[PDB]
Design a protein around this ligand. Structure first.
Ligand SMILES: OC[C@H]1O[C@@](CO)(OC[C@H]2O[C@@](CO)(OC[C@H]3O[C@@](CO)(OC[C@H]4O[C@@](CO[C@]5(CO)O[C@H](CO)[C@@H](O)[C@@H]5O)(OC[C@H]5O[C@@](CO)(OC[C@H]6O[C@](O)(CO)[C@@H](O)[C@@H]6O)[C@@H](O)[C@@H]5O)[C@@H](O)[C@@H]4O)[C@@H](O)[C@@H]3O)[C@@H](O)[C@@H]2O)[C@@H](O)[C@@H]1O
Ligand SMILES: OC[C@H]1O[C@@](CO)(OC[C@H]2O[C@@](CO)(OC[C@H]3O[C@@](CO)(OC[C@H]4O[C@](O)(CO)[C@@H](O)[C@@H]4O)[C@@H](O)[C@@H]3O)[C@@H](O)[C@@H]2O)[C@@H](O)[C@@H]1O
Ligand SMILES: [Mg+2]
Ligand SMILES: [Mg+2]
Lengths: 551, 924, 95, 99, 50
């Protein structure tokens, strides 16, 4: 009596068949593609939504109510553990982790002789899983380390975010990058896949974060570990990068122009594509909100006058370490780093190097009627006429999203050397001078600004002399701030250094005058440097998850 | 005749069901059945949602319709309702178990008209009605909008002239220093290009109209012992109050039966063919009309559609949306047939074999015209969708019945076997890049752009063996025993089949000899029943670990497509990307039937020679092992959803039906049918992840277990602050100021935070009642049906968008009129919070401010009819001629605590119009 | 029933103006009125001779008054309860 | 190694409305009938198809356009026509012998 | 009222044709001989592999 058995599921593959050897490449491609198709407008893997808490940028939109929870994060007041954005980002990052784990589970049950690339594929999956764990560790201090691919779904409920201490969790994250560095090929013809240089750089980043110990219940810095810095220096060695064939591009803008995707400086990048059979293409929907009002709507991710003043330089050619924010940057009478015109689109200047679009201080460019200023971020946006861009209910581009940049690797190595302080400050100064020299030379697309708008560019390297450790650290912080503006790492760097509270309070006090949203802002010493663990997740795992300190 | 005669059965009188003149008979019987909740939005189609005995399970709660013995769950709005002979609602598990394995939520047995033996009749009914839009939300006009924005600016302390929306305010201060607005002026053109003149636009009036309803039915029945037949034609058409939305339906029904030999081999059939064409309103059209400010003109300077320009908020033109949507018309063919053969070898035996067929076919063609309304545009995107769907359900039934009349013992036994098979499929084509942009030209061949193809199929099967035994002693003691063995294709082999027993007892006390002298008590029956029924209404692929090759071709909002396609080479596409698979759900091989146990106790009474009749019922439903789709733990990632038997629900309820019919000395025949009901719902057990994410209640803050289904948790609003002294004395909270909402400190910790929340919402009415009044006098009949609900709370978003300025996601949206009477030092006697541009206090949070008293009492139907005298009718050869004029939804009474309007429909769903109808019936 | 009675019709166009004996070219896209003078005219005393706007339209600048036009002058034309702003500039035919 | 699926759907809908008026007469040996009729016909046809490629399992259960992971195509067309007719038929019979 | 089922397996393998059919005709004569209302309906379902 096969009446109840005649019908079978349609258009799907069952769990038993998904383990077949011929689906392993499909699962690998799935684990890659979750990184481009699993991000929403309000939760992008660039983490710019949660980087508004820093001093680089405001939150765009019509007003404070447009994404009220993100305004709550930005002013660090009225943040609730029952906020949808927190739970959403938690769930999305763990979704990426689980897709990678499924790929790993399929790979681990395959004959290496029959599938020669087994080790390389496993390394790639481990790299992706570690990347997601790194993002989760940055956002929430206490995370669940899901690194067991052969774990039954019923066993997931027993997982806890307090199984390992903070140092152990960092080590577990770094283990995947260590394996990936050991097993990945030196050079990848297939650009999407990570290379050994990328694995090494990201492992160095993991050790760099691990060095700044967060021991104890509070989130305060508890000393700097020398072994981790030694490992950072070991894994950031220029020999590895030369073997991978990576280096700084001749111009700064090439890292963000669509014509130079997968450049020399692009150590690893999320690949976004257009015209590929998808309904609208694997576009960067995460940055869909950040487009200016001229492109049509949503005007999010607006840089800050504090950031512009930071870009402002002195007469000699060095950043104003103390008096940069005293007065607003003046185009005609101040020397300015050329990186400003690659990072921030100021009014009265071409938008993304298009003379047909000149930014104006009218409602055609600001959605909030001047509440959030009139500055427009340029790093993630593209020229409207390069047909890189498409309207899929949100203007999204095919510009790749660079996760690791060779400039980041150089600044990481400089930070490791300075923190080590073993008589090698000169090498860090050399690296900083190299980055600044690249920035100074990066004026191929802004050369006419001198005679068209009276812009004075003045950037110079440093003399190779002995520097005090604190002075070198201050200069390094300034270099990172002017180099990675709008790239969504300022808040994470502030937390890592520990001065997040002081910097954020100073920024609040300074910018409350020019932005009315900071009237009631306030940063708590040991509560707001990490997102709370979601209340929904804590309730679901009863007696297993512990909320961060201060909540 | 209550068919079962020993269970919770409600008989509905079609002679007044037809009076309401509604397309959907289910919608017509909205409040006429105790322990039943009918919710209808008011769209032209009669589509409505039914809940019998409250919420019974965490799955589909739709009741099972049985038309002429063929079960179906499809809505009745696509079937002709004017050819219904009897309606019986079986609400007890014991009574309704015999009619199918999907009877957990109640059964509605519908018997269509049949040829009355030995006579031939014909009826023609015509009806024309006008539907008017009464619940017109009062939104701010241009001047009121300017005044409100000025008030918000001055309350925040900012310069109102900085509004940058073209308003220029002349304003000053009074003696006390409170700002006052002397006047305002406007810039004529909202944009620098002089394309959008400022205007005062009534958007609700612009998108609404006066709808027309047409109904024409023609039935002819012809019956004899030689055989009987019945043929019906029907046409219904409804233009909705919202423009460019409508629904029409053609229907044809053909029933017949033939008795051969002498009484053996009775062959009958019932078939019906329906064709419904519909254009539906776009999602949130009422929301868009409410949001868009009244300053935006309908048409621009050049005749194109007007839209937001400059600093105005981005909302599409609702009139333009309706105009572009007017071509999204779908056609739907429904085919409900059955054929039965009955064999009677001797006096007591019967063998009935029935075959049923239900074929539905939906064909639609959706268009995407390019639009450019001010700054709102889709970059000139033009596309077409051609979508086709097929549903095919067939049932085969076999019944063997025996009856016996030994002495005073009357016993029947029936054994039955039933097979059901449902197969659904659908597929769609999608094309782009059109040139002419008209429905005639827009076809996938004519398209010249990217193309997509979607398609899926599914199905399931059910097998059932049932046995029903009824015994009766002295026509006074009644006993019923039913047993079912049901299996479904949705379960594994081990857990495929399940057994469900049910027992019923009944005692006709009036038959007992000891109460003969009580002659006034015409009849009294006391019945009890305990039954178990099975539930398996889940997804077809419930026990499998599904991996799907989601390439990402499906359209998604926000880009969270979760597709499986990566440009792994790094070339910005240009071809077919490598694809893979993604997990949709985790299989569970231990799922089995959900068990619903129902205990019912009823008392039926009739007094004064069937002049005062009624019933009183008490029921207790307990659903266990509820098949719920529990979500993943969170670190389980995508596809963590899985079905599991981890539920428990309880429903205790009381029902009371009453009816008094009597004549009058001067010749006024009055009939009153009253009804009142109440119930309590509770959740007893629930999976941890379900309780945590709060899809069934609690908002994810507290577990709903032990509380009503759908209950919500929020803050408590203790008025608003009226002075800095009050602000200081209250417990500290972020954003507190003068004129802001004061939230109670529940835990007395001195600070307001996310822990200061409590149960505030309970979606269960205290009681729901209905009353039907029928008066006959000198050929004039007046019918009045009232329906009331008492003790119900409703969460309102219209209140959120009318009592607050800048509470929506985007600012400067149009608001409700009652916003004007907000609190201010000039206007102290108020409870609406003061206007502000920044939601510092975060008043969007769930709180008792948005909880309103939804109690109401509305005259659902009224109808005055005149019957032409028999002598004139016979002279005209008509056996019966009748005219009538009726009104539906004419009058309502609501509690004063309800700020909005139409408590039945308190949100942005389709409005409920007032229908004024004139109709006639001819009975040649 | 819904109209606010704010008389939004209000045509506020400007046909032409004549400063002394010189007419002015009017551009509505940027709401500008440019008047040329023969590169020696005293641009500090000009009497607004004629100015025809519309029916029911009143301007801030009256007829017969003298103005200094060394810098652009803002003019507001009001009809009913609507208004429009123009900038009047005078240039000395520079070559 | 080409794998593909076609999902094709076609609809034909023809409706006719007819009206007839007939009169008969039996005067003596003359038998005469006259019939006047009006007829309206309308036919509407339509069809559309989806086409998908790049399947993996290659069985009818798995082969659906959603399960496909390759190039897709969409075809579709429609047509129709109408007819109107007015006809008249007269029959005469004499002595049941001449028709 | 008529029901019908036809099935044919062709001589060529994997080609076949089956058909379900249901026909329902009726007519009613009302008044005395005036107003004769009749109908003829039929529903057919043919599945074929060619
Ligand atoms: O999920 C739990 C909990 O989360 C809530 C809380 O409100 O929302 C968050 C939840 O929803 C998403 C949607 O994916 O995020 C929405 C989130 O996006 C915000 C801030 O980030 O604003 C984003 C922008 O989206 C816009 C775009 O405007 C238009 C309107 O269609 O889109 C195109 C783009 O050009 C144009 O047509 C328009 O400019 O607004 C869309 C936003 O508006 C919503 C929000 O409720 O509905 C309002 C009206 O929009 C309409 O489209 C009008 O035609 C109608 O759909 C509706 O009447 C909703 O439709 C859209 O999300 C732009 O205005 C915004 O700037 C915030 O607006 C919003 O909070 C998810 O990411 C996230 O998980 C609730 O959903 C829930 O309780
Ligand atoms: O696809 C399988 C499964 O989907 C259902 C319900 O989930 O419907 C399929 C789609 O049809 C939808 C369109 O959104 O129907 C909504 C409107 O279409 C009508 C046709 O008149 O309803 C179709 C049919 O399904 C019911 O609505 C049952 O829910 C019946 O009332 C009706 O006969 C119309 O009533 C609605 O306005 C929508 O339901 C689905 O997306 C099921 O039909 C099917 O089993
Ligand atoms: Mg790319
Ligand atoms: Mg408290």
């Amino acid at each position: 009596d096969d009446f109840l058995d005649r019908q079978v599921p349609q258009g799907i593959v069952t769990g038993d068949q998904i383990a077949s050897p011929e689906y392993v490449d499909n699962l690998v491609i799935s684990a890659y593609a979750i990184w481009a198709t699993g991000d929403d407008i309000n939760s992008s893997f660039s983490l710019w939504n949660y980087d508004v808490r820093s001093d680089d940028c405001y939150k765009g939109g019509s007003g404070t109510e447009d994404g009220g929870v993100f305004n709550a994060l930005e002013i660090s007041k009225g943040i609730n553990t029952t906020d949808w954005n927190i739970n959403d980002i938690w769930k999305r990052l763990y979704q990426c982790i689980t897709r990678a784990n499924t790929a790993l589970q399929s790979l681990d049950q395959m004959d290496e002789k029959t599938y020669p690339l087994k080790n390389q594929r496993i390394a790639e999956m481990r790299f992706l899983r570690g990347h997601a764990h790194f993002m989760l560790k940055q956002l929430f201090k206490k995370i669940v380390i899901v690194n067991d691919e052969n774990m039954e779904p019923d066993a997931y409920n027993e997982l806890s975010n307090t199984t390992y201490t903070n140092d152990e969790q960092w080590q577990k994250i770094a283990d995947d990058f260590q394996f990936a560095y050991d097993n990945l090929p030196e050079v990848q013809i297939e650009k999407g896949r990570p290379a050994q240089a990328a694995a090494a750089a990201y492992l160095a980043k993991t050790y760099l974060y691990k060095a700044y110990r967060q021991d104890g219940a509070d989130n305060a810095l508890t000393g700097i570990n020398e072994e981790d810095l030694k490992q950072v220096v070991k894994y950031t060695d220029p020999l590895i990068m030369a073997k991978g064939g990576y280096g700084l591009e001749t111009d700064y803008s090439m890292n963000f122009l669509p014509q130079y995707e997968n450049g020399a400086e692009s150590v690893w990048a999320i690949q976004y594509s257009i015209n590929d059979g998808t309904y609208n293409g694997n576009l960067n929907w995460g940055m869909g909100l950040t487009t200016p009002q001229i492109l049509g709507c949503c005007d999010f991710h607006k840089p800050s006058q504090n950031l512009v003043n930071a870009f402002k330089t002195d007469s000699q050619g060095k950043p104003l370490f103390s008096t940069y924010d005293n007065e607003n940057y003046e185009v005609a009478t101040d020397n300015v780093d050329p990186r400003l015109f690659h990072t921030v689109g100021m009014p009265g200047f071409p938008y993304k190097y298009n003379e047909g679009y000149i930014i104006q201080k009218n409602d055609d460019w600001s959605r909030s009627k001047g509440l959030y200023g009139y500055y427009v971020s340029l790093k993630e946006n593209v020229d409207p006429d390069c047909d890189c861009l498409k309207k899929g209910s949100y203007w999204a581009s095919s510009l790749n999203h660079i996760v690791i940049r060779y400039a980041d690797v150089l600044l990481m190595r400089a930070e490791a050397l300075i923190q080590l302080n073993d008589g090698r400050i000169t090498d860090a100064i050399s690296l900083i001078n190299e980055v600044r020299s690249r920035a100074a030379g990066s004026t191929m697309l802004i050369f006419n600004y001198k005679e068209d708008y009276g812009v004075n560019f003045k950037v110079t390297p440093y003399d190779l002399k002995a520097y005090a450790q604190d002075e070198a650290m201050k200069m390094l912080k300034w270099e990172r701030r002017v180099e990675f503006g709008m790239e969504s790492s300022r808040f994470f760097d502030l937390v890592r250094w520990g001065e997040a509270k002081d910097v954020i309070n100073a920024y609040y006090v300074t910018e409350a005058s020019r932005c009315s949203i900071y009237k009631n802002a306030g940063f708590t010493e040991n509560k707001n440097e990490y997102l709370p663990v979601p209340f929904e997740q804590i309730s679901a795992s009863n007696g297993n998850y512990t909320q961060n300190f201060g909540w | 005749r209550k068919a079962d005669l020993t269970g919770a059965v409600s008989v509905v009188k079609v002679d007044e069901i037809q009076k309401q003149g509604e397309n959907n008979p289910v919608k017509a019987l909205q409040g006429r059945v105790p322990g039943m909740n009918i919710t209808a939005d008011g769209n032209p189609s009669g589509s409505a949602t039914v809940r019998i005995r409250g919420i019974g399970t965490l799955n589909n709660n739709d009741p099972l319709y049985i038309i002429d013995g063929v079960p179906t769950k499809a809505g009745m709005h696509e079937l002709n309702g004017n050819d219904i002979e009897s309606i019986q609602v079986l609400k007890d598990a014991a009574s309704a178990s015999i009619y199918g394995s999907r009877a957990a939520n109640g059964v509605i047995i519908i018997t269509t008209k049949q040829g009355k033996k030995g006579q031939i009749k014909i009826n023609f009914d015509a009806s024309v009605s006008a539907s008017m839009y009464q619940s017109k939300m009062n939104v701010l006009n241009t001047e009121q909008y300017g005044r409100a924005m000025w008030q918000a600016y001055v309350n925040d302390g900012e310069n109102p002239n900085g509004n940058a929306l073209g308003y220029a305010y002349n304003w000053g201060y009074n003696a006390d220093g409170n700002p006052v607005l002397y006047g305002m002026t406007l810039s004529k053109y909202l944009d620098s290009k002089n394309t959008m003149p400022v205007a005062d636009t009534d958007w609700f009036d612009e998108i609404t109209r006066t709808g027309v309803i047409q109904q024409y039915n023609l039935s002819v029945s012809n019956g004899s012992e030689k055989g009987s037949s019945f043929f019906s034609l029907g046409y219904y058409k409804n233009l909705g109050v919202i423009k460019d939305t409508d629904f029409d339906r053609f229907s044809a029904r053909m029933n017949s039966d033939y008795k051969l030999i002498d009484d053996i081999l009775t062959i009958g059939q019932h078939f019906t063919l329906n064709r419904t064409s519909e254009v539906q309103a776009p999602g949130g059209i009422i929301e868009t009309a409410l949001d868009i400010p009244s300053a935006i003109p309908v048409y621009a300077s050049d005749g194109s559609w007007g839209g937001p320009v400059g600093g105005w908020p981005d909302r599409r033109n609702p009139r333009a949306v309706l105009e572009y949507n007017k071509d999204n018309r779908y056609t739907y063919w429904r085919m409900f047939g059955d054929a039965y053969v009955n064999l009677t070898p001797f006096k007591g035996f019967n063998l009935r074999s029935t075959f049923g067929l239900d074929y539905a076919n939906k064909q639609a063609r959706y268009f995407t015209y390019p639009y450019q309304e001010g700054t709102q545009t889709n970059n000139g995107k033009s596309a077409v969708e051609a979508k086709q769907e097929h549903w095919t359900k067939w049932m085969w039934n076999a019944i063997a019945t025996y009856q016996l009349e030994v002495g005073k013992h009357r016993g029947d036994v029936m054994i039955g076997m039933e097979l059901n098979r449902e197969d659904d499929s659908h597929f769609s084509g999608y094309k782009e890049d059109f040139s002419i942009l008209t429905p005639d030209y827009m076809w996938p061949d004519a398209g010249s752009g990217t193309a997509q193809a979607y398609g899926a199929g599914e199905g399931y099967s059910l097998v059932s063996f049932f046995g029903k035994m009824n015994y009766s002693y002295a026509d006074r003691y009644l006993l019923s025993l039913t047993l079912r063995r049901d299996g479904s294709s949705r379960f594994g082999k081990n857990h495929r089949y399940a057994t469900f027993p049910s027992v019923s007892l009944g005692w006709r006390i009036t038959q007992e000899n000891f109460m003969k002298e009580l002659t006034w008590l015409d009849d009294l029956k006391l019945r009890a029943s305990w039954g178990q029924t099975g539930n398996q209404e889940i997804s077809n692929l419930a026990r499998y670990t599904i991996y799907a090759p989601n390439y990402g071709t499906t359209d998604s909002f926000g880009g969270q497509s979760y597709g499986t396609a990566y440009d792994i080479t790094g070339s910005n596409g240009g071809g077919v990307l490598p694809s893979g698979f993604k997990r949709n759900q985790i299989g569970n091989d231990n799922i089995k039937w959900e068990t619903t146990t129902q205990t019912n106790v009823g008392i039926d009474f009739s007094l004064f020679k069937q002049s005062l009749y009624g019933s009183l019922e008490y029921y207790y439903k307990k659903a266990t092992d509820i098949l719920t789709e529990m979500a993943g733990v969170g670190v389980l990632g995508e596809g963590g959803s899985r079905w599991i038997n981890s539920g428990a629900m309880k429903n205790q309820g009381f029902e009371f039906n009453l009816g008094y019919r009597n004549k009058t000395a001067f010749g006024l025949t009055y009939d009153l049918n009253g009804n009142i009901s109440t119930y309590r719902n509770e959740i007893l057990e629930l999976p941890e992840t379900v309780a945590a994410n709060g899809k069934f209640g609690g908002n994810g803050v507290k577990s709903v277990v032990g509380h009503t289904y759908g209950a919500q948790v929020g803050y408590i609003a203790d008025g608003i602050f009226k002075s800095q002294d009050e602000v200081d004395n209250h417990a500290t909270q972020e954003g507190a100021a003068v004129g802001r909402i004061r939230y109670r400190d529940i835990d007395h910790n001195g600070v307001i935070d996310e822990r200061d929340q409590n149960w505030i919402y309970d979606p269960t009415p205290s009681f729901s009642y209905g009353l039907n009044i029928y008066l006959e006098y000198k050929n004039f009949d007046l019918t009045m049906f009232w329906q009331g609900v008492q003790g119900v709370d409703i969460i309102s978003d219209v209140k959120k968008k009318s009592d607050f300025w800048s509470a929506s996601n985007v600012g400067f949206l149009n608001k409700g009129t009652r916003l004007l009477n907000a609190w201010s030092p000039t206007n102290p006697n108020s409870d609406i919070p003061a206007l502000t541009r920044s939601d510092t206090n975060n008043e969007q949070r769930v709180s008792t401010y948005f909880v309103e008293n939804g109690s109401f009492l509305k005259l659902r139907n009224i109808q005055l009819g005149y019957t032409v005298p028999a002598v004139i009718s016979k002279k005209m050869r008509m056996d019966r001629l009748r005219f009538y004029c009726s009104a539906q939804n004419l009058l309502t009474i609501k509690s004063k605590n309800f700020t909005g309007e139409d408590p039945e429909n308190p949100n942005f769903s389709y409005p409920i119009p007032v229908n004024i109808t004139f109709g006639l019936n001819i009975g040649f | 029933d819904f109209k606010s009675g704010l008389r939004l019709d209000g045509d506020v166009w400007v046909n032409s103006i004549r400063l002394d004996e010189y007419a002015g070219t009017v551009d509505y896209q940027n709401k500008a009125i440019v008047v040329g003078v023969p590169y020696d005219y005293d641009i500090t005393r000009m009497v607004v001779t004629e100015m025809n706007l519309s029916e029911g339209a009143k301007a801030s600048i009256a007829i017969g008054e003298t103005i200094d036009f060394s810098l652009p002058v803002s003019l507001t034309v009001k009809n009913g309860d609507v208004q429009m702003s123009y900038t009047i500039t005078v240039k000395r035919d520079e070559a």
